[PDB]
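CORE FACILITY INTAKE
Project code: CF-77B
Contact: R.S. (postdoc)
Sample description: multi-component assembly, twelve entities in total
Requested service: structural model of the whole complex
Turnaround: standard
Below are the sequence entries exactly as provided by the requester. Do not edit them.
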Amino acid sequence: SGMGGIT
Amino acid sequence: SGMGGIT
Amino acid sequence: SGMGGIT
Amino acid sequence: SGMGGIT
Amino acid sequence: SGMGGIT
Amino acid sequence: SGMGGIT
Amino acid sequence: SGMGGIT
Amino acid sequence: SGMGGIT
Amino acid sequence: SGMGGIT
Amino acid sequence: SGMGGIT
Amino acid sequence: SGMGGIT
Amino acid sequence: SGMGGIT
């Protein structure tokens, strides 16, 4: 599992 | 603005 | 399970 | 404005 | 189960 | 199961 | 505007 | 399972 | 703008 | 599994 | 602006 | 702008 994003 | 998450 | 969004 | 959730 | 929305 | 949307 | 989800 | 979107 | 996800 | 995107 | 994550 | 990911 993990986390991430785009901005 | 942005999009993201944590699994 | 997790959480996320778009703004 | 936005959309999101927690499962 | 969980929660979420759109605004 | 899950959740989602379009706006 | 956007579309997305969590499964 | 996971999450994703388009904006 | 963008598109992305986490599996 | 993993994560990725295009912006 | 940017995109990134942690697995 | 860019595209990328983590497997």
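Facility notes:
- DSSP finds no helices and one strand in chain A.
- Chains A and G do not touch (no CB pair under 8 Å).
Invoice: internal transfer
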